[PDB]
Every structure is written in C-alpha cells, then in structure tokens.
Design a protein around this ligand. Structure first.
Ligand SMILES: CC(C)(COP(=O)(O)OP(=O)(O)OC[C@H]1O[C@@H](n2cnc3c(N)ncnc32)[C@H](O)[C@@H]1OP(=O)(O)O)[C@@H](O)C(=O)NCCC(=O)NCCS
Lengths: 151, 142, 151, 155
C-alpha cells in the first residue's frame, strides 16, 4: 500500500528502507542513525566527521533541519570520537550537551566535527561544530561524557 | 518496491514507521518525527521503543534532547502571536538517568519572556516517576 | 607601609571611602573566621528555608553600567548551588564545580542579589543542581543549572 | 573611621597584610582611573588582541583570587572567560553598538593554579542579533583550566 502518498512522502519512505536495508547489512548500527543515514567517516588525513544529507525527513515546520537532529549529529560525532579514546570494550554516555544554533540547517548536507578538550579517567570534555555542505557554521557546542559503568 | 528486506526487530520497527508515516498523510501528525516516534504532543510523551534506543539499550540521547526541544518549543509558541514563531538558539541538557521504561515525559515552562528572547527550562521523566534529563533553552522570535 | 598608601582618602570621594570601609570590614570578619576566602569577605555574601546566598549590590560588584557584573552573578549562583551540594554529602566526600550553565534575564540591580538553589539529581558520581538569582523585588536576574563532581 | 579600624594590621599575618596592600593599590589605581571598575582594578587584569583575531585576558594569581584550597576560585575563572569574550565581542562591533552577556557555559577541567591565568576567546558567529563566542582558560604552563562558550546580545 502506497496509493495516496505524494512526492514528499515518496522518498521520505524510500530512504527509510535504504537505511533499514543498510542497518541489516551490518550490526553495531543504531536505528535513529540508520534512517537519517548519519554516515560517519574518516579522511585520508586521519580526521573524522559525521556529515549527513538533508531530506524533508529531518526538517521542521520552519523548513530547516530539526535542531534536535542537529543536536543528535553533534552528539554522535562527539560520542563516537570519545569512544575511540577508550580502551577496547569500554563505552561512554553523554552527561551534558550544550548547543549553539548559529545558522539554520539547509542545503545538501550538514557536517559535524568533534575534538577532545580534556580526557579524565571518568569524565571527558569535548567541543564540536556542525557546518553546511559549503562551510557556514550551523551549530557549535561542547558536552561531557562519562565512562559507562553498568551496575 | 524491492522492500523485501529480515528479523523481528525490523518487523516491529517498520510497522510503526509506516503506522506513523500514514498517520501524517491523514494529517493527524504535524511532522514526520512527532509521528514516527509517536510523540504524544498534546506535555509531550515518548513511547520507548527500540526505534528510540542507542546501541546500549537505552533511549538515545539526541532523542531525549529532541523530546525536550519540542516540549520547550510548543511551550514558547503558546505565548507567541499567530504570525510569530520561536526558534531554538541555545540548548543546555543534563542527562541524569538512562532513558528506560515504557515511555518518557517532558514538561517545559517559560523562565522569562522578552521581545526577542524567551528563556525556558524543562525536564524529562520515565513512567515510574524518575527524572531522566533536565535542561534550559533560549528561543528567539521571528 | 599600607597606611602610607591608604591616603587614597586624601582625594577619595564618598563611594571611594565607603568601598574601602566595607572592604576592611569584611577582612576583619575574615579574621574572625566569618568567611573562608577573601572573595567572600569583600563580596559580603551571607547564607528549603535555609539555602539561598545573598550578595549586597555595591560598587565593588557593578560593571561600567551600574549593574552587577554577570561574572559575579554567576559566582553567586555557583556559591548557592555549591554549598547546597556540600551539605548533601558525607564527611568523607566533597564536590567541585564541573559544569556551569547560566542564562542572564535582567540587569542585576537593587540593594542586593538573592540566589536560591535545588538539587536536580543526586548520583554517585555527580550532583546536578538548578537555581535562580533574584532581585530585592523578586524579579529574575538569571536562571541556570550546574553540575558538581564528587571527590 | 577606616583608620581606627586598622586593628587589622595588628593580628594580621603576612598574607592578610599582603592582601590589603594589593587591595589598597587597586582602589588607588581605581581613582586615578587607570581602570573603569573595582573588579578589574583589584584583580589587575591585562587585556589585548592577538596577532590572530582572538582576544586575551590574563589575571595574576594571588591569595585574593584563590578559594579555601589555594585554587583559583571557579568564579574568578568564569568572570575571566566572560571578560575575555566580552572585550572580544565589543572590539568587533560598531562605535554605535554594544553587547551584553546573554548566555554563558563553562566546563571546568583542571584547577586554576600557578602565577596567572590566561583566558583566550574567539568569535564563533557574528549575527546582528546575537554574537556567539568561545574561549579557554590556561595556566602559566599551557594547561587548560577551563573551556566554555558564551552568547551575547547586541545593543
Ligand atoms: C552520565 C551519568 C552516568 C553520570 O553518573 P551519575 O549521574 O552519578 O549516575 P549514577 O552512576 O550515580 O547512577 C546511574 C543509574 O542508572 C542506572 N543504570 C541503568 N542502566 C545502566 C547502564 N547500562 N549503565 C549505567 N547505569 C545504568 C544505574 O544502575 C543507576 O541506577 P540507580 O539510580 O538505582 O543507582 C548518569 O547521569 C547517566 O546515566 N546519565 C544518562 C546518560 C544517557 O542516558 N545518555 C544517552 C546518550 S549516550
């Protein structure tokens, strides 16, 4: 059943499956990141960035990417980066997240870059920025992570 | 639609995905997310499902923030004119306890209302009355 | 030879003499162990039903616009939430400020500042606390949250 | 009667007597108007723009700025970052414009210690509405005492 759906509801679902398809093709991937397709990558320099293409799926009634999704993008770049600095087997959880929505998210993609400010045995402070498919800063933020210790 | 994609995890998920996408075309849900994630926007509730869980089997952070984000936004448009809307500017969020249980509840209340900027705070909770997240936000009018 | 220097009076206008007077008051008090730091001395901070610090809005605390320096406002808030957390802790444990988030609402003015604080979460590793700063009118100067680390 | 109240220097240890000495200098440099405010005057901050765009504010560390454990008061740290971020914002603004600290966020990392603190701020965004800036505080070793962001409202 797909009869009634318009253009926008067309790919807003097409991609939902390219992802549910991609999430199957490999574990360790989470749902929320699977659909939005927040692809994490590493350049030939060793750098790291979590950019993602903008689709009607991520916008709001103001037609700009959801601040909350931009939040999640930054949270990821920062989360995945933190985990890298941890011994094998360990994980971190976001303690505090502070975002500064500089400019509106629009265009092809958003790009997120993170950087460790200070790493402690328990708490890790990180800064990070989200740019546009061009270069303007969409958001800037920092946050704190804790080395998970499940009871 | 070669959507012949599968296990049970995906079974349930995609069921909400579509139960939710076709709840938007029937225009009962504002956005795709307020529906895709059954946001009981009316206070804002969040049905805790594997669709909203990170790899560590708990409500995803970006989510708990979006939940708080939304609650806060509405809360600021209730005090705004028909031709003016509030856009998040800043979002401070403290994660206190994992997002776990049947659902998440986010209550937001304005701390200060100015001609250009409004300050708001609010929390998120689990069904058993536990406090999940807590943060502040600043919204500019447009 | 400070006394030689304290001829700052030979020219001192009224507030010049009144600011100096209050400074020496606080110090004396600092000796009578009324405070822990000189910061508390000169500022004159005095501390639900019990936890709310108050700071007298004099010239020693204002900025080039005759309102309390947001710096000091934040320092006051940090004090309210700071000693508020110390109370909720065993003799063997203490806490240092980890994260401080503040939203400035109205210019700090009047005869004093009053900040009330409350624990938003008491966990093994950190204690999150929210709090607000008020005028002698009840008007909100600033609202902010804070995270405290246990040591 | 500030004089008859100098029974403070007759039960005052080196530190206490050392403090007031600075304080008097402060207040003294205050009336000569070498400083607009008492806070800046009593803390002796030195501010300046760097070759790059960033802004710098250093603050001498003395007993006057420490907390019960001879560590720079978290408040003076915040107030410093704020000061740096402010002067930064204001230097990038027209003569007929000004800015006021709207939001402030800080993450404490290492105990402020040594002989002086060095806060460094840089603009992250420059709207005509609000100005988002960012900064860091360093010890005299280069160790990061604290990191934080601040949004400023334009007037
Ligand atoms: C960040 C954090 C770990 C800081 O430590 P803290 O505040 O001292 O938390 P504590 O360790 O004291 O308590 C954690 C509680 O969560 C519980 N918990 C449940 N599942 C857990 C898990 N998988 N790992 C760790 N704790 C878990 C702990 O058992 C404990 O329960 P309790 O209240 O009965 O003691 C804590 O605030 C937290 O868990 N925040 C949630 C972060 C989050 O949900 N992030 C999502 C995006 S990654």
């Amino acid at each position: 059943f797909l009869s009634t759906a318009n253009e926008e509801e067309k790919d807003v679902l097409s991609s939902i499956v390219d992802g549910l398809l991609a999430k199957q093709e490999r574990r360790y991937a989470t749902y929320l990141a699977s659909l939005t397709q927040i692809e994490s990558q590493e350049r030939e320099d060793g750098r790291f960035e979590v950019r993602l293409p903008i689709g009607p799926l991520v916008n709001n009634p103001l037609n700009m990417v959801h601040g909350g999704i931009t939040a999640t993008l930054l949270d990821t770049a920062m989360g995945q980066m933190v985990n890298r600095q941890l011994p094998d087997g360990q994980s971190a959880v976001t303690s505090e997240l502070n975002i500064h929505y500089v400019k509106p998210g629009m265009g092809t993609y958003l790009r997120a870059v993170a950087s460790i400010v200070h790493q402690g045995k328990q708490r890790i402070v990180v800064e990070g920025k989200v740019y546009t498919d061009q270069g303007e800063t969409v958001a800037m933020g920092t946050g704190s992570f804790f080395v998970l210790r499940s009871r």
